[PDB]
Design an enzyme around this catalytic site. Structure first.
Site, PDB file in Angstrom:
ATOM      1  N   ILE A  93       5.459  -5.037  10.499  1.00 49.53           N
ATOM      2  CA  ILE A  93       5.072  -4.584   9.171  1.00 49.53           C
ATOM      3  C   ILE A  93       4.626  -5.797   8.362  1.00 49.53           C
ATOM      4  CG2 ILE A  93       6.716  -2.689   9.302  1.00 49.53           C
ATOM      5  CD1 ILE A  93       8.433  -4.162   7.262  1.00 49.53           C
ATOM      6  N   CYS A  94       4.119  -5.529   7.158  1.00 55.63           N
ATOM      7  CA  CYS A  94       3.683  -6.600   6.262  1.00 55.63           C
ATOM      8  C   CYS A  94       3.887  -6.111   4.827  1.00 55.63           C
ATOM      9  CB  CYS A  94       2.237  -6.995   6.520  1.00 55.63           C
ATOM     10  SG  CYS A  94       1.751  -8.603   5.832  1.00 55.63           S
ATOM     11  N   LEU A  95       5.035  -6.460   4.256  1.00 53.52           N
ATOM     12  CA  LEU A  95       5.302  -6.211   2.848  1.00 53.52           C
ATOM     13  C   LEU A  95       4.887  -7.420   2.021  1.00 53.52           C
ATOM     14  CD1 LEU A  95       8.785  -4.431   2.948  1.00 53.52           C
ATOM     15  CD2 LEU A  95       6.559  -3.416   2.425  1.00 53.52           C
TER      16      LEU A  95
ATOM     17  N   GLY B  79       0.956  -2.995   3.990  1.00 51.07           N
ATOM     18  CA  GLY B  79      -0.353  -3.105   4.607  1.00 51.07           C
ATOM     19  C   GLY B  79      -0.325  -3.757   5.975  1.00 51.07           C
TER      20      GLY B  79
END
Ligand SMILES: [Zn+2]
Lengths: 157, 79, 351, 254
Positions: A93-95, B79
């Site tokens: 993921i990429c928060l 994202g």
């Protein structure tokens, strides 16, 4: 081979989580080959919010703390193939709070991180999808998207 | 009092106790808490009973009682 | 064609290794440049003697056709594979992408051959858009504790300044219709989450929260961002100052006090049954709504803890499962089996 | 006097194919440093810029600055008769009124010679290359062409949105909508097949599909295409040659 700040901060992060963590969540350092704990790699579980399709399921993640922690953010990863629009096919993921180039601050606790991963489950960002199976359904078939999430919730339960 | 009310704004470490009238918009309430922490007001999520709060709302719009707690979280995007 | 990099308080450049220089050319495919150098017995001993405060750092700079304006950041081409005598160097030469100047030099010291032999540094790269210049300097290390000694000599943020800030931020609330009754400040360091010993912040910080100066210098050795961990403003090492107001609280507080509540005038009070024998353990059971604090023997099984909690909820024990660290716990298992400590949490869920 | 000799006749054929379906009259300016050619379509929004260095020709000679105004739809017919294994050579006088295209086969030992009448094309359009751009991405030209082709049959406007190290092409039409997302990566074992991204600022632009359909026709030149996007500036799509390039200046829609 671990720096003085990384060890001290990781020891405090485990001390805080031991006595005060949100309900339904769990997070513990993984074990090495000799049985001792690895403070730079944790196993955690994110429960879905009640009322949403993710409810009833506790979804496991991996929290890998780099050598530069807490100057660098940790890395969170679902199991490969996890069904969510903003989750890579590998499970990454990429928060924004976990991005060193964005909103990562050294004062961010594990409690704030696991709450941020939870808020992403039922609130995807269409402006930047990371996989295809979940992005297609979320962008042209909401009925089947909720079918998989209701199935994946029963999968991790 | 019956005209004013006390509210608590916390982030888990530092917290400030305020007192305003039930008709005062919480926009002034949020900008004060963020400015005293060195942050921008558009970078925090203020929640009441687990629901986000708009800048136009007032304590009487959400039926806030006395010594109610307002939780401040970090704004994020995936994202 | 030499490049002047931005100096660092943790290391001061001493002498250049002339042979340890290589260039990176623009290419769309694979590329690789090597550099063979030999060290004298004096330099080898200087770097290999135990407790040596000297290292051999490998610097990298991006060539600018407009000319170097000085104080260049450290920038390596990526992707790349740095090697020193066939040893793949896994140092963090990337830093932060959006913040130039957060990349640290590569340490060649642990991989040096004896002075009688010839060393070799190799940099493999691919798909480069700019030209890069590599240098190999001998530096002298400066520990964070040495930098802290200079911070304590710098002028402090006096109590008068904090009282003025508290009075200023109070009247600004009155104009906005707000009334700040009290403020609860944390004595914990936001960087290490330990009790602050050297509460500090930049003199240009417009906030009340402080951070530990010593641990802040530890974080700059990790990644040299040089920004406040609270408000993210740029911070120079000379502008870091101890807070006289926050330091006096720590000198007149108990070490278990994590938070203090203060009013706008500067007055403050410390925020504060758990005593047990050395054979029992304090636990905290919760079901998401109510929480009961138990105190049972470390050898006694958790079976009677689960019964006493289910009974106070008017529900049968067969319908409640109890989780510790995510794993369900059996009745025959004692807190010693599960490596529990005081103030641990046991969660209860229905079926 | 001019004498430029293309080592491969198909090279100059692919160049003219890159902007003959959008521009009809091009002014080729020849100098001792190379050949420069810049033109613009009737919409005055798409500017085609061409540069060829002397290192790309097998041999080259240009004693004086010569300007060669040609008609592309007529020049493409001459190049159509040439073979992809021949050697094209351009010849013109010091004050030329026509050009001579000499096709020399390298294997069968054949020679074919054509001639084209020069036209006088006035006006000009200097290639205004911007100083910097918000984002700069480069990817294989074959993959970028399929993206534009798959989306052009969905809308007459394609949107390029770059955010969070992610490139998302969006096409919103009347019948339906689609999207293609590519992720940056630079593999050291095969760098020529990489999708490199140098994002200084997240950009969000939109371009006409019919204009991009003409730009992708330069895929026959280079295996890769560079896209430099800016907010307050037109986009730059470039295809690299051996010593030159064919680039396009398209302004986004607002
Ligand atoms: Zn600050």
């Amino acid at each position: 081979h671990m720096s003085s700040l990384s060890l001290q901060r990781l020891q405090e992060e485990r001390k805080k989580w031991r006595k005060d963590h949100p309900f339904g969540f769990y997070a513990k350092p993984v074990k090495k080959a000799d049985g001792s704990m690895d403070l730079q790699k944790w196993e955690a579980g994110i429960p879905g919010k009640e009322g949403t399709n993710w409810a009833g399921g506790v979804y496991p993640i991996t929290v890998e703390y780099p050598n530069e922690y807490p100057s660098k953010p940790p890395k969170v990863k679902f199991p490969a193939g996890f069904y969510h629009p903003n989750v890579y096919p590998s499970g990454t993921i990429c928060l924004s709070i976990l991005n060193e180039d964005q909103d990562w601050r050294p004062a961010i606790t594990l409690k704030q991180i696991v709450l941020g991963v939870q808020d992403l489950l039922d609130s995807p960002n269409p402006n930047s999808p990371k996989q295809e199976p979940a992005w297609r359904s979320f962008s042209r078939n909401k009925a089947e998207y909720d079918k998989k999430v209701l199935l994946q919730a029963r999968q991790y339960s | 009092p019956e005209t004013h009310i006390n509210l608590k704004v916390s982030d888990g470490s530092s917290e400030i106790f305020f007192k305003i009238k039930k008709t005062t918009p919480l926009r002034r309430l949020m900008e004060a808490f963020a400015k005293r922490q060195g942050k921008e007001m558009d970078s925090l999520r203020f929640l009441y009973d687990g629901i986000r709060i708009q800048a136009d709302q007032t304590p009487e719009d959400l039926d806030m009682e006395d010594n109610d707690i307002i939780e401040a979280h970090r704004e994020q995007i995936g994202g | 064609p030499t490049i002047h990099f931005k100096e660092s308080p943790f290391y001061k450049i001493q002498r250049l290794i002339p042979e340890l220089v290589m260039n990176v050319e623009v290419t769309g495919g694979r590329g690789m440049c090597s550099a063979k150098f030999k060290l004298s017995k004096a330099d080898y001993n200087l770097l290999s003697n135990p407790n040596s405060k000297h290292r051999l750092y490998l610097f990298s700079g991006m060539i600018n056709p407009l000319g170097s304006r000085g104080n260049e950041p450290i920038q390596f081409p990526f992707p790349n594979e740095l090697r020193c005598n066939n040893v793949q160097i896994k140092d963090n030469i990337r830093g932060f992408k959006s913040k130039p100047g957060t990349a640290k030099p590569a340490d060649l010291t642990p991989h040096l051959k004896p002075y009688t032999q010839q060393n070799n540094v190799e940099l493999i790269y691919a798909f480069t858009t700019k030209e890069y210049k590599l240098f190999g300097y001998i530096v002298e290390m400066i520990t964070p504790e040495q930098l802290l000694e200079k911070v304590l000599q710098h002028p402090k943020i006096i109590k008068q300044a904090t009282l003025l800030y508290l009075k200023k931020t109070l009247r600004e609330d009155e104009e906005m219709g707000l009334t700040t009754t009290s403020t609860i400040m944390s004595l914990q360091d936001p960087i290490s989450y330990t009790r602050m010993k050297y509460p500090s912040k930049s003199i240009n910080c417009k906030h009340l929260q402080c951070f530990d100066a010593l641990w802040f210098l530890h974080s700059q050795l990790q990644i040299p961002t040089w920004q406040c961990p609270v408000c993210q403003i740029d911070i120079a090492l000379e502008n870091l100052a101890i807070s006289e107001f926050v330091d006096d609280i720590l000198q007149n507080c108990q070490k278990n006090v994590e938070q203090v509540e203060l009013t706008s005038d500067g007055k403050w009070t410390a925020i504060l049954d758990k005593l047990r024998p050395e054979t029992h353990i304090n636990l905290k059971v919760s079901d998401g709504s109510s929480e009961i604090f138990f105190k049972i023997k470390k050898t006694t099984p958790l079976r009677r803890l689960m019964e006493a909690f289910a009974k106070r909820q008017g529900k049968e024990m067969d319908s409640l499962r109890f989780l510790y660290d995510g794993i369900r716990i059996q009745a025959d298992q004692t807190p010693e089996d599960l490596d529990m400590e005081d103030n641990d949490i046991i969660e209860a869920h229905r079926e | 006097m001019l004498e430029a000799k293309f080592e491969e006749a198909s090279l100059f054929k692919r160049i003219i194919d890159g902007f003959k379906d959008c521009v009809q009259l091009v002014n080729f300016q020849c100098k001792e440093d190379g050949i420069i050619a810049q033109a613009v379509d009737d919409s005055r929004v798409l500017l085609v810029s061409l540069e060829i260095g002397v290192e790309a020709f097998q041999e080259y000679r240009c004693d004086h600055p010569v300007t060669l105004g040609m008609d592309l739809t007529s020049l493409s017919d001459i190049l159509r008769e040439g073979n992809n294994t021949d050697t094209l050579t351009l010849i013109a006088d010091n004050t030329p009124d026509s050009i001579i295209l000499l096709f020399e086969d390298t294997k069968k030992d054949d020679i074919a010679e054509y001639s084209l009448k020069l036209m006088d094309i006035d006006a000009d359009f200097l290639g205004i290359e911007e100083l910097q751009y918000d984002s700069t991405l480069s990817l294989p030209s074959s993959e970028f062409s399929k993206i534009v082709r798959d989306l052009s049959q969905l809308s007459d406007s394609i949107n390029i949105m770059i955010t969070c190290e992610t490139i998302k092409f969006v096409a919103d039409g009347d019948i339906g909508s689609g999207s293609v997302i590519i992720k940056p990566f630079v593999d050291m074992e095969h760098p020529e097949t990489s999708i490199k991204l140098e994002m200084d600022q997240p950009v969000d632009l939109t371009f006409g599909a019919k204009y991009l359909l003409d730009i992708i026709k330069g895929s026959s030149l280079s295996d890769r295409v560079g896209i430099r996007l800016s907010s307050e500036a037109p986009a730059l799509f470039q295809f690299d040659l051996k010593s030159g390039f064919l680039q396009f200046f398209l302004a986004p829609k607002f």
